[PDB]
Amino acid sequence: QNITEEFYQSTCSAVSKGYLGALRTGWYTSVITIELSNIKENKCNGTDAKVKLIKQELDKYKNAVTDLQLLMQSTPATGSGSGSGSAIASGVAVCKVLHLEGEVNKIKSALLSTNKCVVSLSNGVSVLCSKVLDLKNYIDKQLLPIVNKQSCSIPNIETVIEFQQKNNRLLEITREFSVNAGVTTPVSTYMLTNSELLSLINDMPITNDQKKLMSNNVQIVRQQSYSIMCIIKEEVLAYVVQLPLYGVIDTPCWKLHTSPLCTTNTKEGSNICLTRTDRGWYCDNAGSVSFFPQAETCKVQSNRVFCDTMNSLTLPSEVNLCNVDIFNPKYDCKIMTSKTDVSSSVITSLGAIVSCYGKTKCTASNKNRGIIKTFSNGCDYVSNKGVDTVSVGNTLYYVNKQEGQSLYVKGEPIINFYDPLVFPSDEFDASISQVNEKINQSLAFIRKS
Amino acid sequence: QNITEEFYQSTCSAVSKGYLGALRTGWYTSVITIELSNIKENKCNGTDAKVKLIKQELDKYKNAVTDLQLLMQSTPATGSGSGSGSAIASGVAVCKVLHLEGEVNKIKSALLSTNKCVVSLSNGVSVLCSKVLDLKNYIDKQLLPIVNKQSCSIPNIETVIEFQQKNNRLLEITREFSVNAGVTTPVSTYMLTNSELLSLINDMPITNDQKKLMSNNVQIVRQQSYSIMCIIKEEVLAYVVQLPLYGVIDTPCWKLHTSPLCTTNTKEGSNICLTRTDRGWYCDNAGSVSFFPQAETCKVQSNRVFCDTMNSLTLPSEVNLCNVDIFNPKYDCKIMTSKTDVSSSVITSLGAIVSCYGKTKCTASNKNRGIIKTFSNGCDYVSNKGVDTVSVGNTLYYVNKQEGQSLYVKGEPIINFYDPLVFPSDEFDASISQVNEKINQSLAFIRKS
Amino acid sequence: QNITEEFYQSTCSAVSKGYLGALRTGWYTSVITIELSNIKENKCNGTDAKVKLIKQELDKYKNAVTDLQLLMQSTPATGSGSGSGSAIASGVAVCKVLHLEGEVNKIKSALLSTNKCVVSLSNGVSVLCSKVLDLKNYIDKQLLPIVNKQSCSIPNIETVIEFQQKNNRLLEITREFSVNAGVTTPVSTYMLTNSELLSLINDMPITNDQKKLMSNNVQIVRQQSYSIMCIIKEEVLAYVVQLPLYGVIDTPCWKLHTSPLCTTNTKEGSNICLTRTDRGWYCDNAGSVSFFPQAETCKVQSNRVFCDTMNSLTLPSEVNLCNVDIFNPKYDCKIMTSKTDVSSSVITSLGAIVSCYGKTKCTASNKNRGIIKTFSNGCDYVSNKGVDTVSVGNTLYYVNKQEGQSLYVKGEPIINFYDPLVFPSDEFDASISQVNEKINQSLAFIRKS
Ligand SMILES: *[C@@H]1O[C@H](CO)[C@@H](O)[C@H](O)[C@H]1NC(C)=O
Ligand SMILES: *[C@@H]1O[C@H](CO)[C@@H](O)[C@H](O)[C@H]1NC(C)=O
Ligand SMILES: *[C@@H]1O[C@H](CO)[C@@H](O)[C@H](O)[C@H]1NC(C)=O
């Protein structure tokens, strides 16, 4: 609906609210096929320029078939990997089934009359299937009567051009698989055109709002999808496309922005600093909160966010209390500490946080008026209403011009509650209570002494 | 001019000097256009092979137009992002203006007679514009007289081939935008050929030395540029190219190399280590120093460095004192500590730093003579004069064969000034004074006790 | 042979054994050539459609030549770089030799009669050379008799099509070099087709098992290779391909998986945690152990691993004792500590580690039976026998279905040996003995007190 934002002066952080998230929980697996011609070289003494062109294109066809066959003798073990495991295990499992005898023929028979099909494999999985290119028919009908005789017939020039056009897609598909070891992401238009992807979506056994969501964000769907080279067997080239399944829809999401909060004493080396940890995207999910620490996990389109759950953490919903009261006793809010008071800015959804320290020149400007605000040392914020850019030292930042409402939540910088002499100043992954217990230990060594 | 280098034995670091930096401060925004034909299908009963080829290519043209139109219904909200904000906000702001009524026609009128133009938008921005492909004229003149009648005329075979060539660039442009959600970087030769880029540079209202700088480093310019898909309206396909504006030129730059400095006691677990932080590129800029911590921010061509200011920090010029005296009282030099005395090497501009610990075999070699130096435990350095490679354990490193002069600055390893029993040995982001104050606190707990 | 795996309950880690490693120690350098035609424009008044097509393709040829020439005036100084130095120094050194007078002609003469050659340069390096495209002969024989007269001859339509096909590869090669500043990796099929790569391998002066290894893993060879644009001189386009040389073969390798080990007290903020550091691939190498911390350094195909030594560390073989006894006195096993008891899983080679803390729902499932195991708080493990997935909170993980045998090594979680009140709970890069000495210091402040 409406994007809103809150800046917390006390902790030098901001939350952008109002987003609606779709979270990828599963995969749709589809088998894409190219029908091939099983032909060997039938060289006949031909020297005319058009037979030579047809022969040269037929060699590129053949080398594409054999290159794919060589690629397959080394199964997709270099596909993907992580502690998160295989993103392609769903597709890989369909490939395994496809190497079973009679399975390829089962797709042959469904595609004997139509372009799209549904096939129930012998493992219980009912996959959609699609033939996107028919080379077997083209080659068997227009080119074998040319080359498979004693002396070659002469094709017309339009057959030469037409065959280069049709074969082109096989060769590009083969080029993409060859440099990516048989797994590509995003899925190119060569693997699946927009028209084929949209038809695939439209033909799936899913609700209408799931069809409409994926159809209106096809480029995000492409970027979250995989194409896995499966098998070349019995005149069939088959590869599996994994499209994202969003098992969480329209869930409330927010983004946390953080920036270093330091004291502003004039003598360098006398200053302590703190920064809230775990910036990034948060989404309500199934009674908990899903947190996405890696910036690439979530794609944003205006009001809507699309996130992959594979590299997310599941947190209690009380994690949000760190944005109402960082000292709350229900969740141990996390911070890191340092004495590195370097100046910086963070562009948020509706404004900009500025951490200005030392001698840095920090300002906010408008295109037509120039400088309209000069920041003082400390952590501060400006909204995108009437501000176009922010400058911190020698770096210029553009503020997002998205519509929405910002709220400045005044409050004492919490760094001012700490005594600089007993402050644990080099904590890389700490927490409010962890810092307070280290301070309790440092007052105790002086209490008895 | 002359690249020179200094190795500081006392802190296991080196500085390479003599570079001349250009720092990207802004953007040139240019509107690139393709003139389209607004035609719907005019199917006529044609079965001849040449009409079929023309129809098939015209469908690929149409699907490219509609794919771009679908891509645009989801505005560039997944373009780029960071705490640094939008790198494309300048281009995005031009796109917004372009969606305003009459603006497209204003580019139409400037390009009514010539290929390049200058257009002042209704927001005060005077952009250069360029038409790189004219499909409207080609289609309206050579192909509508073919297909837009009752029965189709037959084109000659050269028209089939010529149209495939002209349409190819539209389709590739469309392919690139489709997998990148409407924003690409580097800018491909499909978006802008070298000839069009060089002409664009040459035609800009900028000084001659700025023209010559960008023209002599076009591949660096390409890699620092963006192409943003704007609009398809009124037979015009328009996208905006952002080229880097170097607002700092020929500024002195240097690169800091660092390596772990450890004691060399024979019993493992008894050794302490220190490493200088903030390796990377430094450039004088506007009375301060711009520091680039991320390795990809700066491209180097021989003597010259090209850096983006977006992910840089602005430091006081006294930061350089950490290379003359790391204990100086004007700047709090930063270090990290540990007990991980693993061996490694760092290839610098003119040589190699070697940190050799434990039982590691560390040597430097020449191609023709083999091993010419054997390192002992500690941190040491060799220049590229007469050395081709360095080996540390099982890893071989090639030294850069660039011309220049190295200087070995002798000095006591500062790790030897510290008492291993009160040394803070696991500081991730500390500083000379921060370590000294932690040591003062650790001598105080024993002073009274 | 057989992949096996051991899970160490005491330290929440697992080792996957049985892999056979090939480690890249060096480079094969090969010179790839394209023979060019040194022709300037010989415009003659021609307006026929076929001369126009030939002229237009000849301009694309010419602009490709000049674009490559402009790219070369800026030598490969933006190729690659790191503290590890140039991965391409071997190739770059061949380019330098190639700019020497008479060297190009020396490759001309070897390729005067055959397609492949061996040439000894004046620096003692005997490189294999290959001509992959002959444009000089095609242009001088089929196209100069067309355009280089007073009025242009008319080519047949097959010459137009044939020349577009032959020139295409020059233009794509030029496109790839243009956006990558003259250095590409992986090496595309445009740079080197599978047939040319396999022939290059087969023709090298290396043993038969090295030929067979690289020929059976060509896509891994491609991904570990470089293509470096060298020179355009005297009708020769030359670029150098660097293929990996595996100087270590069939060496035993293993992979270390780690996960956080925390106490499981019910009150949040009262829990301490530890995690073993230095997860990743380890390989026996030359009496030491090569360790690869970066996930992309090693490619895995079933039973076999292929690693680059450039970003590896060399460790004593006693590093493996951290997998038999983490308290052993021969090697100081490394750990990091924290109070962040967030739940997670790690998919291993043959199973899954699960660290379940707080209120997280953690389970393992089978496709046909659903949930078959529910984890309790702590660190635990399940093998891939009869398990398909694992769920931790809202994230689902797929287990690898590779064949092999897992072993569960029971043992007391070592985190239970530590007193939570004197535990150093925020150590980013520590070690068993380092933690024990910090605890000794914390018992001493209370011993006297
Ligand atoms: C430190 O001691 C005070 C005094 O009892 C107590 O209120 C506070 O909660 C303690 N903090 C920690 C982290 O133990
Ligand atoms: C530690 O104490 C000595 C003695 O007064 C002083 O010279 C030094 O500057 C102190 N260091 C810090 C970091 O406070
Ligand atoms: C701590 O002290 C005990 C008692 O002497 C000793 O056994 C142990 O090795 C010490 N640990 C360290 C790391 O010094």
Residue whose pair of structure tokens reads 């520091």 in the numeric block: B291
- Per the document, the length of chain C is 449
- The closest alpha carbon to B273, from B257, B262, B286, B289, belongs to B262
Verify that B89 and B192 share a domain, yes or no. yes
Could you please report the per-residue DSSP string of C322-359?
A: GGT-TT-SSS--EEEEES----EEEE-SSEEEEEE-TT
For C76-102, b where at least 16 C-beta lie within 10 A, e where not — what string? bbbbbbebbbbbbbbbbbbbebbeeee
The residue from B222, B248, B274 where one domain ends is: B248
Same domain, A72 and A123: yes
- How many residues in chain B? 449
Nearest atom, ligand 2, residue B433 CA: 13
Contact C429 B338 (CB under 8 A): yes
* C53 contact residues in A (CB cutoff 8 A): none
Per the CB < 8 A criterion, the answer to whether C313 and B393 are in contact is yes
Alpha-carbon gap, residue B369 to C434, rounded angstroms: 43
For residue C415, give the amino acid letter: I
* Residue whose tokens read 């609906």: A1
Which residue has tokens 């946390």?
A256
- Please give the backbone phi and psi of residue B194, each rounded to the nearest 5 degrees, phi first: -60, -40
Element (DSSP H or E) covering residue A217: none
The ligand minimizing its distance to the Cα of A440 is 1
Element (H, E) at B268: none
Assess contact for C6 and C255: CB atoms under 8 A: no
Of A159, A223, A396, the CB nearest to B181: A223
Q: Whose CA is nearest to atom 12 of ligand 3?
A: C437
**Residue B53 has which token pair?**
């080829």
E strands, C206-339, where? 226-233, 236-258, 261-262, 273-276, 280-285, 288-292, 298-301, 304-308, 313-315, 334-338
B118 vs B204: CA distance, rounded Å: 10
C252, two tokens = 């035993």
The span from the CA of C80 to the CA of C181, in Å, is 10
The distance of Cα A210 from the centroid of its chain, to the nearest Å, equals 19
**Bridge partners of B127?**
B119
Domain of residue C415 covers 4-22+249-447
Q: What atom of ligand 2 comes closest to residue B436's alpha carbon?
A: 13
Residues 6+ apart with CB under 8 A from B448: A449
Tell which residue, A352, A332, A336, A323, has the closest CA to residue A276: A336
DSSP character at residue A438:
H
Q: Which helix (H) or strand (E) holds C177?
A: helix C157-179
- Give residues with Cβ within 8 angstroms of A152, minimum separation 6: A44, A45, A46, A51, A146
Tell how strand A126-134 and strand A116-120 pair up.
antiparallel
Nearest by CB: B84 against A188, A193, A347? A347
Q: In 3-state terms, what secondary structure has residue C49?
A: helix
- What does DSSP say about strands B126-134 and B13-35: parallel, antiparallel, or unpaired? parallel
Q: Does B186 sit behind a cis peptide bond, omega within 30 degrees of 0 on the bond before it?
A: yes
DSSP letter (8 states) at residue C188? P
Buried b (16+ CB within 10 A) or exposed e, C223-244: bbbbbbbbbbbebbbbbbbbbb
Please give the C-alpha separations between residue B404 and each of A58, B3, C78, C398, in angstroms, as whole numbers: 55, 5, 18, 54
Same domain, yes or no, for A387 and A289?
Answer: yes
Contacts 24+ apart (CB under 8 A), A192-198: A192/A32, A192/A132, A192/A227, A192/A241, A193/A132, A193/B63, A194/A218, A194/B63, A194/B67, A194/B70, A194/B178, A195/B63, A196/A130, A196/A132, A197/A221, A197/A222, A197/A243
Q: Could you give the CA distance from residue B388 to residue B404 in angstroms, rounded to a whole number? A: 15
C18 and C29 housed in the same domain: no
Beta bridge partners of B382: B352
- Per DSSP, the three-state class of B54 is helix
Q: What is the CA radius of gyration of chain B?
A: 30
Q: What is the b/e burial string over C154-170, where b = at least 16 CB atoms within 10 angstroms of the residue's CB? A: ebebbbbbbbbebbebb
Q: Which has the closest alpha carbon to A316: A285, A337, A292?
A: A285
Report d(CA C434, CA A377) in Å as an integer.
39
| Amino acid, res. C314 | T
Contacts of A302 in chain B (CB under 8 A): 75, 77
Question: Which residue's C-alpha comes closest to atom 4 of ligand 2?
Answer: B440
- Put simply, the answer to whether A400 touches B85 (Cβ < 8 Å) is yes
| CB distance C115 to C269 below 8 Å | no
B168-197 burial, b at 16+ Cβ within 10 Å, e below that, comes to ebbbbbbbbbbebbbbbbbbbbbbbbbebb
SS3 A102: coil
**Strands A334-338 and A344-347: what pairing?**
unpaired
Cα dihedral sign, B163-B164-B169-B170:
positive
**C36 and C53 fall within a common domain:** yes
CA–centroid distance for C342 within its chain: 31
Rounded Cα distance between A20 and B283, Å, is 43
On whether the CB atoms of residues A333 and A322 are closer than 8 A, the answer is yes
Sign, CA dihedral B41-B47-B49-B51, equals: negative
Closest of A379, A399, A400 to residue A389, by C-alpha:
A399
If you count DSSP H runs as helices and E runs as strands, how many of each does chain B have, helices first? 10, 24
Atom of ligand 3 at shortest range from CA of B269: 13
Mutate to test the pocket of ligand 2, among B437, B441, B442 (most ligand atoms within 8 A of CB): B437
Structure tokens at C255: 């992979």
Residues in chain A preceding a C-to-N separation beyond 2.5 angstroms (breaks): none
Q: Which protein residue has the closest C-alpha to ligand 3 atom 13?
A: C437
B420: helix, coil or strand? coil
Tell me phi and psi for residue A51, to 5 degrees: -65, -40
Q: C322-349 b/e with 16+ CB inside 10 Å = b?
A: bbeebeeeebbbbbbbbbbbbbbbbbbb
- How far is A345 from A396, CA to CA, in rounded Å? 9
State the residue for tokens 């190699």.
B352
Cβ C343 vs Cβ A314: under 8 Å: yes
Give the C-alpha distances (Å, rounded to integers) separating B321 from A359, A371, B314. Answer: 17, 33, 15
Structure tokens at C278: 């230095």
Q: Do B70 and A218 touch (CB under 8 A)?
A: yes
If one counts every other C-beta atom within 10 angstroms of the C-beta of residue C441, the result is 15
Cα B171–chain centre separation: 27
Q: In one letter, which amino acid is A220?
A: I
Same domain, B361 and B381: yes
Q: Which of C12, C395, C421 to mutate to test the interface with A (most CBs of A within 10 A)?
A: C395
Compute φ and ψ for B436, nearest 5 degrees: -60, -30
Question: For residue A316, is the peptide bond before it cis, meaning its omega torsion is within 30 degrees of 0?
Answer: no
Say if strands A405-409 and A4-8 run parallel, antiparallel, or are unpaired.
parallel
Dist CA B184 CA B180 (whole Å): 6
Burial string for A87-106 (b: 16+ CB within 10 Å, else e) reads bbbbbbbbbebbeeeebbeb
Q: Which ligand lies nearest to the CA atom of residue B435 in the structure? A: 2
- Quick one: CA dihedral B121, B123, B126, B127, positive or negative? negative
CA of B188: how far to CAs of A108, B303, C181, C335, in Å? 40, 26, 12, 46
Residue A378 and residue A265 in contact, taking contact as beta carbons nearer than 8 Å: no
CB neighbourhood size of C428 (10 A): 18
> Shortest CA distance to B278 belongs to which of B223, B234, B320, B230?
B320
Nearest by Cα to A422 from A443, A393, A402: A443
Report the amino acid identity of residue A41. E
- Residue B347 sits at the vertex; the CA angle it makes with B346 and B349, to the nearest 5 degrees, is 130
For chain A, what is the total number of helices (H) and then of strands (E)? 10, 24
Q: How far is C446 from chain B (nearest CA, A)?
A: 11
Phi, psi of A406 (to 5 degrees): -105, 150
The two tokens of residue C348 are 């291993």
Determine whether the interchain pair B342/C313 forms a contact, defined as Cβ–Cβ distance below 8 Å: yes
Rg for chain C, CA atoms, rounded: 30
The two beta strands, A126-134 and A13-35, are parallel
Structure tokens at A53: 């062109």
Of A229, A248, A267, which residue is a domain's last?
A248
Distance separating alpha carbons of residues B163 and B167, to the nearest angstrom: 6
Select from C19, C175, C188, C219 the residue whose CB has the most chain A CBs within 10 Å, as the one to mutate to test that interface.
C219
Question: Measured between CB atoms, which of A188, A358, A398 is closest to B85?
Answer: A398
Question: Measured between alpha carbons, how far is B284 from B287 in angstroms, rounded to an integer?
Answer: 7
The structure tokens 């026929």 sit at C48
Same domain, C235 and C268: no
Ligand nearest to the CA of C436: 3
User: Does B437 sit in the ligand 2 pocket, CB within 6 Å?
Assistant: yes
Q: How far apart are CA A282 and CA A289, in angstroms?
A: 6
Q: Which of C65, C76, C77 is nearest to C37 (CA)?
A: C65
Detail the DSSP E strand segments found in B82-190. Answer: 116-120, 126-134, 183-184
State residue C80 phi and psi, 5-degree precision: -145, 170
Prior bond of A186 cis (ω within 30°): yes
DSSP assignment of B8-34, as one string? ETTTTEEEEEEEEEEEEEEEEEEEEEE
Helices (H), C194-254: 194-202, 208-215, 218-223
Same domain, B101 and B224: yes
Residue C440 Cα to ligand 3 middle (Å): 7
At C136 the three-state DSSP class reads: helix
C-beta atoms of A74 and C338 within 8 A: no
What's the gap in Å between A436 CA and the centre of ligand 1? 7
Q: From the CA of C269, give the closest atom in ligand 1.
A: 13
Please report how many Cα atoms fall inside a 13 Å half-sphere around the Cα of residue C170, on the Cβ side: 31
CA dihedral A114, A118, A120, A121 (to 10 degrees): 70
Residue C274 three-state SS: strand
CA of A338 to the centre of ligand 2 (A): 19
Q: What's the gap between Cα C206 and its chain centre? A: 23
A149 and A231 together in one domain = yes
Pairing of strands B370-374, C313-315: unpaired
User: B37, B235 in Cβ contact below 8 A?
Assistant: yes
Q: Within a 10 A sphere around the Cβ of A266, how many other Cβ atoms?
A: 8
Asked if residues B384 and B391 have their Cβ atoms less than 8 Å apart, the reply is no
Q: Which residues of C touch B169 (CB under 8 A)?
A: none
Q: How many structural domains comprise chain B?
A: 2
Nearest-CA neighbor of B75 among B88, B60, B61?
B88
Task: Tell me which method was used to determine the 3D structure.
Answer: X-ray
Q: Does A358 contact B181 at a Cβ distance shorter than 8 Å?
A: no
- Choose among C26, C2, C32, C4: nearest CA to C17: C4
State the DSSP string of B69-83: HHHHTS-STTS---T
The CB of A440 under 6 Å from ligand 1? The reply is yes
Question: What resolution, expressed in A, was reported for this entry?
Answer: 2.3
Element (H or E) spanning A445, and its range?
A: helix A432-447
Which residues of chain C neighbour B193 with C-beta distances below 8 Å? Answer: 63
Instruction: List the chains bordering chain B where 3 or more Cβ pairs fall under 8 Å.
Output: A, C
Same domain? For A327 and A388 the reply is: yes
- Using an 8 Å Cβ cutoff, are B108 and B38 in contact? no
Domain boundary among B225, B248, B271: B248
CA-based nearest distance C369→chain B, Å: 39
Name the strand (E) or helix (H) holding B229: strand B226-233
Q: Are A79 and A17 members of one domain?
A: no
Q: With an 8 Å Cβ cutoff, are C332 and B359 in contact?
A: no
3-state SS class at C265: coil
Q: Return the bridge partners of A229, or none.
A: A239
How many angstroms separate the CA atoms of C138 and C142, rounded? 6
Rounded to an integer, what distance in angstroms lies between the CA atom of residue C120 and that of residue C106? Answer: 9
Q: CB of A333 within 8 A of CB of A318?
A: no
> Phi/psi at C286 (nearest 5 deg)?
60, 40
- Enumerate residues 6+ apart whose C-beta is below 8 A from C27: C90, C91, C242, C243, C244, C245
CB A373 within 8 A of CB A352: no
Residue A391 near residue A363, CB atoms below 8 Å: yes
Query: Across the strands, what pairs with A395?
Result: A392
Q: Atom 6 of ligand 2 has which residue's CA nearest to it?
A: B440
Q: Alpha carbon of A276 to those of A334, A335, A413, B306, B322: distances in Å?
A: 6, 4, 12, 33, 29
For residue C432, give the nearest of B340, A154, B26, A291 by alpha carbon. B340
Residues with CB under 6 A from ligand 3: C 433, 436-437, 440
Q: Which two tokens stand for residue B47?
A: 């079965």
Helix %, strand %, coil % for chain A, to 5? Answer: 30, 35, 35
Atom 1 of ligand 3, nearest CA residue: C440
Chain C residues touching B394 at Cβ < 8 A: 23, 25, 285-286, 288, 290, 309, 312, 314
Name which of B241, B80, B93, B75 is nearest A347 in CA terms. B80
Question: Which residues in A270-424 belong to E strands, given as ranges?
Answer: 273-276, 280-285, 288-292, 298-301, 304-308, 313-315, 334-338, 344-347, 351-356, 362-366, 370-374, 378-383, 389-392, 395-398, 405-409
Question: Is residue A306 domain-shared with residue A200, that is, in the same domain?
Answer: no
Residues across chain A = 449
| Among the bound ligands, the one closest to the CA of B440 | 2
